[PDB]
């Protein structure tokens, strides 16, 4: 019990040492602020995907964002933080050393400029953003109980390993040399490939909104799309700007890159839509392009020269705009918008990080990297591809397994089969289920949950 | 006129000393940021209580939140800050030493890590949040002029004394040893018991929405409930996280506790509703439970171990969920939602702080406390109860007096009696009052103020 | 290549020096946070002017705020930052030294407490707020392509010179001694006089909403007005609080002044409306008065004693409230709300800064000024008037030239003449333009762009 700084456990005895002395207070303030900013991205995701939908979802994703904030916070506390950021992990996962945040306090975190407790706060927001991306992707005819269980399991066995490989103290992707500045792999590529697994296993096939001569854009609520894009772009300054872990000017450089990629992505997607529609101005397109650029710059924001951030707007916006068209070749809508922006945007950004990463940008705050093709470090592109392939293999395969194992268990089935659920119009004709008469989630105090036509 | 640091008055002469040298700049930045975050809780309250209402209020609480931000800011400047945070107070109140913020500048505040001027900014937001809680509680058939006068008086003679006892330099509750980390007494218990006084003296009796077989949840606007809950949870990181007064990791520890209590409160209330309705998922319940947990953890966030923060979600959510049922036993709706979340949630949290407060949590930033039952400091629970009883006696009794003294004065009567006001439908039939035809506050440029049927 | 700190170029070689050593990290964190806060004012402007409109605009200003965020960010990167904040400017403009942010990194900025890259982030938000004020002012029957080109040109040749005179390293207004704390000239007076140029050249004359016995207030969406006012007041803490460039308590003093001016402006405008309507409570008026006070205090917030901030609420709210009446004398509505709040509010605030500026307020963080009439520095009022006259002459004249040169070019004409555009109801009857049937921007994926009746 000398209690001096150990770098392990709680970091020392608060009655004997001031744990705050190990950290620059301004670093801590910025990462605390950035945590608050990432938190508001959670309802941003909900608003965005609620608004863009071409189908009336029975579950309101604006409200489901709060449900996801609750489920993710509890999972992170319970063991999610420990599985990613315990200090004694393997190369593929952490441990249960910090179960229920036991001994999470003032030791320097995997990011040594902030203590464990603050790194826990910040990184837990990333877990929550990914949870609402997953709830958004799988929200069509979802049952709420099974969805909450799914999110808990999916965070534990899909998010946490991929996050560990990317960020953990011994993560194998970190060792390989792959670059991922703000977690494009664990957040965007991961949620995107998981969305794809949902689309192909549980999504509706031959979907009327994706079949024949149907509009590409047919939004539920433009004002929801816009409000979600506002919260997402506002919060993304914390998402990317805080991923330095410090108050250095690399944080602000990352913010300039973030803003410029969002801006160029928005204008690019709208310009592509203008060419492809023969002169129309796409309100949905401007918002999706801003998100495409934000996703695109996420792996790169603290590594690439400011002038290259425009390419992280332009190229993801172009490729994602055409990716959305694959919904019509497959005739599937469910889950595919999250796949198109986050999987395809995240893959493109991760790949381009291997091209444009620069050692002199990372060195703005002393961070040492070999760099990308900008430094003729040709091997970097293969490290990026190794990262993307690992994320895709794990996220798609394990998400498929979870969805299908729950589908075979009757009370955990996330989405009832079409032949077993009752119609809201016929439920409204029953007295013990009369509240389905109100099919508008603005005055209804109850979720219009799918009901098995066996009761 | 040597102007060196005195700790009194302006703190020194700006032409001779740098007043900023007394403070850690990172402490100041966090409390400045947290002030901005608490500010957005003001419209959060308005949105939440506007949306949850089972009655169409003529006054829009989203808009009334801005009115309350204006009235509270002026009252705080005029003498509210001085009555709580003057440096020469008694044990029950401050003074008028800082009338119109005279000499409020660079002396270390009652919280010595920030200067008076910044502490004034931060604490004034708490006064404003309490003002909109009070306007929300008393908004049914309120007359706007009288309401603005009421809020000014109520802040001066109810909020400011209770805040002084809790936070002031010589406040008697501080001396007793009562713990109240982020102002659960002055903000939540206070507004809650004042709401109760409104309910029992001015609220409608035998209210059709609270009588017989009526729905417990019947919201005006679910999207308003959700947007309000978003702003409240986002801002609460400043409300609780800033209540350390510093940039230490106790601030971030308080944020982790805040997030986990909100999350567990939301899931608990929804689970209780699911059991009590026989299988329904309550969209209103999830939001009210998040607020219950946020209120519950407010007195405790910087004092309790992280694993106990889940109890500050669970137990307030359970007890508050049943408290809302008392609206049906009394057959009163007006004011009772604010009472149920803030009085009952604040009382439960204050009580549980005496159980779970821990000296090693407070000591994260050097703060010295005897602790709670966690440290077998058994007397702490009685100090907490002394605090709650003082708040309840003062807030309920003095709020009752104000409401009844204004009720007896004809131009200050806050709520016209049912027999003396004219119906909006009959006002619409008069030309000098034709604008009451529009009973929807979305296109109407005028408040649909109650009009005495004597003109 | 010694790479030590030069104060020029990139500021030094990142491989040889730590550029962050030149700056207080807490200063950087506050200005980074304040940048994020100013960003959300961009959609705040859009919401406010969308909601207040007495006419149904075909272009949604909430959505157009994102378009403006994109166009302004790209212009700032391309050459806007360089034209204002290059380190080698003349007295009237900067240069293209920092084209595409070349060499923008760690040299101390024109504001020496933050590096170029962070000053670029922060000041670029001001450029974007001004862009959405301009898009709001000119939004009636705007064509989106021409508007985007107009904003790019207008930022380059109107905003950037005026910003340079106000803020640039050799700006002539700075040399004269004019005071403008947070950019009331470049943001508010500038956008306001440019709006006036739009009103008088492109606005509709003899407008039915401004002719005869018509309501002064007749809003499109009160909830939009309120949400915009919320985002604007929340973000204005960064707008004014960050304009110190540091973490000193002058930042927090500026925030107290900002809040009190907003509060007193809101209550004053509502009280004026109450007297002028004979007893009505104006929901629009409370919001416009808060904005009037925010605009009014912008040039003054870091220079005037706290008790005088109430005059920056009261007097702008009174004068602006009567200015709005000039819409009825001219019978023009288009562009005039932005003129009335930002030109008239900004002029009044700039003038009153010469009266109330105090050397002891500026000296809170070491800033040295002669002061205003408060210091019997009588000449200060003439320096303020010189500033306002220069802004008005440049903004009005050059904006007029741009609008008229584009008007004469057929594919750049911003607003089609009434005789050449087709009616949305007749477009809806054509198949290649059928989407004009939906005249509500909430479900329509396409901007209802004006179409020449020649195709």
A214 three-state secondary structure: coil
| Residue C437 DSSP code | G
The enclosing H or E element of C350 equals helix C345-356
What count of CB pairs under 8 Å joins A to C? Answer: 166
Q: Which two tokens stand for residue B425?
A: 């439908």
Tell which phi-psi region holds residue B8, choosing left (phi > 0), alpha (psi between -120 and 50) or beta.
beta
Contact status, residue C354 vs residue C232, Cβ threshold 8 Å: no
**Burial (CB count within 10 angstroms: exposed 0-12, middle 13-18, buried 19+), residue C2:** exposed
Q: In this structure, is the dihedral angle defined by the CA atoms of residues A216, A222, A226 and A229, taken in order, positive or negative? A: negative
Return all residues near B417 (Cβ < 8 A) that are at least 6 apart.
Answer: none
Instruction: Find the residue in B nearest to A40 (Cα).
Output: B234
B369 three-state secondary structure: coil
Q: How many helices (H) and strands (E) does chain A have?
A: 18, 0
Whole-angstrom Cα distance, residue A87 to residue A94?
A: 8
Beta-bridge partners for C421: C452
Report A:275-294 residues touching C (Cβ under 8 A).
Answer: 277, 280-284, 286-287, 290
Q: Across the interface, do B69 and C233 touch by the CB < 8 Å criterion?
A: yes
Q: Across the interface, do A445 and B30 touch by the CB < 8 Å criterion?
A: no
Whole-angstrom Cα distance, residue C301 to residue C303?
A: 6
CA distance B361 to chain C (A): 26
Give Cα separations from B325 to B49, B55, B329 (angstroms): 17, 17, 7
Return all residues near B436 (Cβ < 8 A) that are at least 6 apart.
Answer: B424, B425, B427, B428, B448
Q: Which of A36, A114, A235 is best to mutate for the B interface (most B CBs within 10 A)? A: A36
- Contacting partners of chain B (3+ CB pairs under 8 A): A, C
Q: Across the interface, do B66 and C223 touch by the CB < 8 Å criterion?
A: no
Q: Across the interface, do A445 and B283 touch by the CB < 8 Å criterion?
A: yes
Contact status, residue B304 vs residue B369, Cβ threshold 8 Å: no
Name which of B356, B226, B235 is nearest B303 in CA terms: B356
Whole-angstrom Cα distance, residue C445 to residue C142?
A: 17
Contact status, residue A19 vs residue B364, Cβ threshold 8 Å: yes
Contact status, residue A166 vs residue A183, Cβ threshold 8 Å: yes
Give Cα separations from C413 to A279, B220, C317, C338 (angstroms): 16, 45, 35, 21
Question: What share of residues in chain C are helix, strand, coil (percent, to 5)?
Answer: 65, 0, 35
Beta-bridge partners for C115: C108
Chain B residues near residue A63 by CB distance under 8 angstroms: 222, 226, 283, 286
* End-to-end CA separation in angstroms for chain C: 63
Name which of C12, A156, C358 is nearest B15 in CA terms: C358
Report A:197-236 residues touching B (Cβ under 8 A).
Answer: none
* End-to-end CA separation in angstroms for chain A: 63
Q: Which of A446, A448, A451, A452 is best to mutate for the B interface (most B CBs within 10 A)? A: A446
Q: Which two tokens stand for residue C220?
A: 């499109």
Give the DSSP letter string of A384-401. HHHHHHHHHHHHHHHHHH
What count of CB pairs under 8 Å joins B to C? Answer: 166
Chain A residues near residue C19 by CB distance under 8 angstroms: 249, 364
Contact status, residue B106 vs residue B4, Cβ threshold 8 Å: no
| SS3 per residue for B1-23 | CCCCCCCCCCCCCCCCCCHHHHC
Whole-angstrom Cα distance, residue C38 to residue C126?
A: 7
CA distance C237 to chain A (A): 15
Neighbours of B213 (CB within 10 A): 5
Q: Across the interface, do A70 and B264 touch by the CB < 8 Å criterion?
A: yes
Whole-angstrom Cα distance, residue C404 to residue C424?
A: 26
Name which of A230, A226, A196, A208 is nearest A40 in CA terms: A230
Neighbours of A397 (CB within 10 A): 13
Q: Does C324 contact chain B (CB < 8 Å)?
A: no
Report A:361-380 residues touching C (Cβ under 8 A).
Answer: 363-366
Contact status, residue A104 vs residue A407, Cβ threshold 8 Å: no
Phi, psi of A53 (to 5 degrees): -60, 140
Chain C residues near residue A243 by CB distance under 8 angstroms: none
Give chain C's length.
455
Q: Angle of helix A116-137 relative to helix A25-52, nearest 10 degrees? A: 10
b/e map A10-37, b = 16+ CB within 10 Å = bbbbbeebebbebbbbbbbbbbbbbbbb
| Residue A172 DSSP code | H
Return all residues near B138 (Cβ < 8 A) that are at least 6 apart.
Answer: B147, B150, B195, B198, B202, B334, B335, B403, B414, B415
C215 three-state secondary structure: coil
Q: Which two tokens stand for residue B324?
A: 């809302």
Name which of A265, A19, A188, A211 is nearest A118 in CA terms: A19
Q: Across the interface, do C39 and A233 touch by the CB < 8 Å criterion?
A: yes
Contact status, residue C99 vs residue A306, Cβ threshold 8 Å: no
CA distance B279 to chain C (A): 34
Radius of gyration (C-alpha) of chain B in whole angstroms: 22
b/e map B390-414, b = 16+ CB within 10 Å = bbbebbbebbbebbeebbeeeebbb
Contact status, residue A302 vs residue A244, Cβ threshold 8 Å: yes
**Closest Cβ–Cβ partner in C29, C307, C366 for B29:** C29
- Contacting partners of chain A (3+ CB pairs under 8 A): B, C
- Contacting partners of chain C (3+ CB pairs under 8 A): A, B
Whole-angstrom Cα distance, residue A270 to residue A281?
A: 7
Q: Angle of helix B116-137 relative to helix B160-167, nearest 10 degrees? A: 130
Chain-centroid distance of CA B346 in Å reads 10
CA distance B285 to chain A (A): 8
| Torsion on CA atoms B132, B138, B139, B142, rounded to nearest 10 | -120
Contact status, residue A242 vs residue A251, Cβ threshold 8 Å: yes
Q: In this structure, is the dihedral angle defined by the CA atoms of residues C437, C440, C442 and C447, taken in order, positive or negative? A: positive
Q: Across the interface, do C36 and A283 touch by the CB < 8 Å criterion?
A: no
| Torsion on CA atoms C20, C242, A45, A166, rounded to nearest 10 | 10
Tell which phi-psi region holds residue A99, choosing left (phi > 0), alpha (psi between -120 and 50) or beta.
beta
Q: Angle of helix A144-154 relative to helix A116-137, nearest 10 degrees? A: 130
Chain A residues near residue B248 by CB distance under 8 angstroms: 20, 25, 28
Q: Does C303 contact chain B (CB < 8 Å)?
A: no
C339 three-state secondary structure: helix
Name which of A327, A376, A332, A321 is nearest A354 in CA terms: A376
Q: Angle of helix C283-297 relative to helix C222-241, nearest 10 degrees? A: 20
Contact status, residue A283 vs residue C445, Cβ threshold 8 Å: yes
Name which of A284, A237, A243 is nearest A259 in CA terms: A237
Give chain A's length.
455
Instruction: Find the residue in B nearest to C37 (Cα).
Output: B36
Domain definitions of chain C by residue range: 1-455
Neighbours of A409 (CB within 10 A): 9
Provide the CATH topology of domain C1-455: Ammonium transporter fold (1.10.3430)
Name which of B37, B145, B50 is nearest B338 in CA terms: B50
Q: Across the interface, do A62 and B249 touch by the CB < 8 Å criterion?
A: no
b/e map C140-150, b = 16+ CB within 10 Å = bbbbbbbbbbb
H helix intervals, C78-217 = 81-85, 116-137, 144-154, 160-167, 172-176, 190-201
* End-to-end CA separation in angstroms for chain B: 63
Beta-bridge partners for A282: C446
Q: In this structure, is the dihedral angle defined by the CA atoms of residues A425, A426, A431 and A435, taken in order, positive or negative? A: negative
Phi, psi of C108 (to 5 degrees): -60, 135
Give Cα separations from B139 to A396, B52, B60, B312, B398 (angstroms): 52, 13, 9, 29, 19
| Residue C260 DSSP code | H
Tell which phi-psi region holds residue A194, choosing left (phi > 0), alpha (psi between -120 and 50) or beta.
alpha
Chain-centroid distance of CA B310 in Å reads 22
Q: Does A248 contact chain C (CB < 8 Å)?
A: yes
Give the DSSP letter string of C286-316. HHHHHHHHHHHHTTTTTTS-GGGHHHHHHHH
Matching residue, tokens 């894009």: A229
Whole-angstrom Cα distance, residue B142 to residue B239?
A: 29
Whole-angstrom Cα distance, residue B247 to residue B118?
A: 14
CA distance C192 to chain A (A): 25
Report C:89-148 residues touching A (Cβ under 8 A).
Answer: 100-102, 104-106, 115, 117-118, 120-121, 124, 144-145, 148
Q: Across the interface, do A29 and B24 touch by the CB < 8 Å criterion?
A: no
Phi, psi of C168 (to 5 degrees): -70, 165
Q: Which two tokens stand for residue A218?
A: 């047919």
Return all residues near A381 (Cβ < 8 A) that are at least 6 apart.
Answer: A351, A354, A355, A372, A373
Give chain B's length.
455
Q: Which of A36, A37, A226 is best to mutate for the C interface (most C CBs within 10 A)? A: A226
Q: Does B71 contact chain C (CB < 8 Å)?
A: yes
C50 three-state secondary structure: helix
Whole-angstrom Cα distance, residue A81 to residue A83?
A: 6
């Amino acid at each position: 019990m000398s209690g001096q700084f150990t770098g392990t456990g709680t970091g020392g005895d608060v009655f004997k040492v001031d744990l705050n002395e190990q950290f620059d207070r301004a670093d801590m303030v910025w990462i605390g602020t950035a945590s608050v900013l990432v938190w508001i991205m959670i309802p941003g995701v909900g608003l965005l995907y609620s608004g863009i939908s071409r189908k009336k979802h029975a579950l309101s994703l604006m409200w489901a964002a709060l449900m996801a904030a609750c489920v993710a916070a509890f999972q992170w506390f319970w063991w999610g933080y420990s599985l990613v950021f315990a200090h004694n992990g393997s190369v593929f996962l952490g441990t249960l050393q910090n179960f229920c945040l036991k001994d999470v306090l003032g030791a320097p975190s995997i990011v040594k400029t902030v203590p464990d407790i603050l790194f826990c706060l910040y990184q837990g927001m990333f877990a929550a953003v990914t949870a609402i991306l997953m709830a958004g992707a799988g929200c069509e005819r979802a049952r709420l109980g099974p969805m909450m269980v799914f999110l808990f399991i999916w965070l534990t066995v899909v998010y946490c390993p991929i996050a560990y490989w990317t960020w953990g103290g011994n993560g194998w992707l970190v060792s390989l040399g792959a670059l991922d500045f703000a977690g494009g792999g664990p957040v965007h590529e991961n949620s995107g490939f998981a969305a794809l697994a949902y689309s192909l296993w549980l999504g509706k096939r031959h979907d009327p909104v994706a079949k024949g001569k149907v509009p590409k854009y047919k939004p539920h609520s433009v004002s929801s799309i816009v409000m979600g894009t506002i919260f997402l772009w506002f919060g993304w300054y914390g998402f990317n700007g805080g991923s330095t872990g410090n108050s250095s000017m690399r944080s602000w450089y990352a913010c300039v890159n973030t803003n410029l990629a969002a801006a160029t992505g928005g204008l690019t997607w709208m310009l592509v839509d203008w060419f492809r529609t023969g002169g129309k101005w796409s309100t949905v397109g401007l918002c999706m392009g801003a998100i495409a650029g934000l996703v695109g710059i996420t792996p790169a924001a603290g590594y690439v020269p400011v002038y290259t951030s425009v390419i992280f707007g332009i190229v993801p916006a172009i490729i994602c705009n055409f990716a959305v068209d694959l919904k019509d070749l497959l005739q599937i809508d469910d889950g595919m918008d999250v796949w198109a922006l986050h999987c395809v945007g995240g893959f493109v950004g991760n790949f381009m990080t291997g091209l444009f990463a620069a050692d002199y940008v990372a060195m703005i705050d002393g961070t040492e990297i070999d760099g990308g093709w900008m430094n003729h470090h040709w091997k970097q592109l293969g490290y990026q591809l190794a990262g993307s392939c690992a994320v895709a293999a794990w996220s798609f395969t394990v998400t498929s397994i979870i969805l299908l194992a729950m589908d075979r268990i009757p009370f955990l089935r996330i989405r009832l089969h079409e032949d077993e659920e009752m119609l809201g119009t016929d439920l409204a004709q029953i007295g013990e289920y009369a509240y389905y008469a109100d099919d508008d989630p603005e005055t209804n105090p109850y979720v219009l949950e799918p009901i098995r036509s066996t009761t």
